[PDB]
Design a protein around this ligand. Structure first.
Ligand code: NAG
Lengths: 98, 49, 48, 130
């Protein structure tokens, strides 16, 4: 999309997370410390999503001035909120009400 | 050709009581034709072409 | 020892960090002054 | 179709007024293909129900370059009540008519320093002769 766009998009911090081995929080902490953008894209599942945000609030990314957007499966259910997500989380989900 | 433009200024020590009325008794000397009159009698009399 | 520098004093970023300036009372610039050479003239005889 | 024309959530968030002056602040309409402002222009709103235009020029490149050094955020919006300000029996209307009304907190554009306006707001250092 970026190549075929007159509008200017700034790309940065394209690093991924290899959350597979134990005691990776120290590695995650440096990975979480390399983000310097007002909005950060995150793509995980409902079970995996809560693990990442346990470190996100530790450094202090969550709050005003920072926005996180996740796919539909991160929320999982329309009402069953695990309360493990930062205030202001916005996501796109499949239509179910109509 | 002029390459560094910055006007003059009646500097004063920071945080001085007079710092506001001086900057308004200069802006009022431009409009009345005063500082265009001192310019006439001191700086713009012609002696050589 | 002085409270008001009534003189031609340019305003720039180094001085403005310690003292307070006013609104400019003259707008200027920097220009170069060089000696004017003689215009000369070549007309004394019509055999030129 | 978003129900919120502007995001509700917002002191580094400053309103800023501007007006169209021919060589300084040029207002060009939004590109039809994408409906968004292209490069080199900071998006600028408009009143009448809002329409998003795009602004660029000499007095805008100052705003982008200054904002980088002092690290704040802004959102321009064109003024729709008079131009540049004029005192009509105790009312100011224009780029200088909103800063006092506590709806602007800044006014970038082609203003002009003089005594009558300077009793209401306090201008910055001049940066061009006029
Ligand atoms: C500046 O002028 C105002 C106008 O009357 C006056 O009230 C004030 O005392 C003056 N201040 C100084 C420092 O001259």
């Amino acid at each position: 999309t970026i190549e075929n766009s007159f509008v200017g998009w700034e790309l940065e911090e394209v690093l991924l997370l290899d959350m597979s081995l134990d005691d990776g929080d120290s590695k995650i902490q440096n990975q979480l410390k390399k983000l310097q953008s007002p909005i950060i894209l995150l793509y995980c599942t409902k079970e995996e999503a809560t693990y990442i945000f346990e470190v996100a609030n530790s450094v202090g990314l969550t709050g005003y001035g920072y926005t996180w957007i996740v796919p539909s499966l991160v929320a999982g259910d329309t009402d069953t909120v695990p309360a493990e997500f930062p205030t202001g989380l916005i996501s796109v989900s499949y239509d179910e009400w109509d | 050709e002029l390459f560094f433009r910055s006007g003059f200024g009646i500097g004063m020590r920071k945080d001085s009581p007079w710092k506001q009325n001086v900057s308004l008794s200069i802006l009022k000397s431009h409009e009345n034709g005063f500082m265009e009159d001192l310019d006439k009698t001191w700086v713009r009399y012609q002696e050589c072409d | 020892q002085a409270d008001m520098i009534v003189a031609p004093l340019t305003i720039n970023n180094e001085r403005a960090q310690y003292i307070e300036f006013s609104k400019p009372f003259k707008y200027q610039g920097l220009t170069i002054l060089v000696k004017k050479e003689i215009p000369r003239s070549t007309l004394d005889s019509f055999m030129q | 179709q978003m129900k919120y024309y502007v995001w509700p959530r917002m002191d580094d968030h400053l309103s800023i007024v501007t007006l169209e002056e021919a060589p300084f602040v040029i207002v060009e309409s939004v590109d039809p293909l994408s409906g968004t402002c292209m490069r080199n222009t900071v998006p600028c709103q408009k009143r009448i129900g809002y329409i998003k235009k795009c602004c660029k020029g000499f007095c805008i490149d100052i705003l982008k370059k200054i904002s980088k050094s002092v690290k704040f955020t802004y959102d321009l919006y064109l003024v729709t009540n008079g131009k540049h300000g004029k005192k009509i029996n105790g009312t100011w209307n224009g780029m200088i008519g909103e800063v006092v009304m506590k709806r602007a907190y800044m006014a970038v554009g082609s203003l002009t320093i003089n005594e009558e306006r300077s009793e209401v707001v306090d201008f910055s250092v001049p940066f061009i002769e006029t």
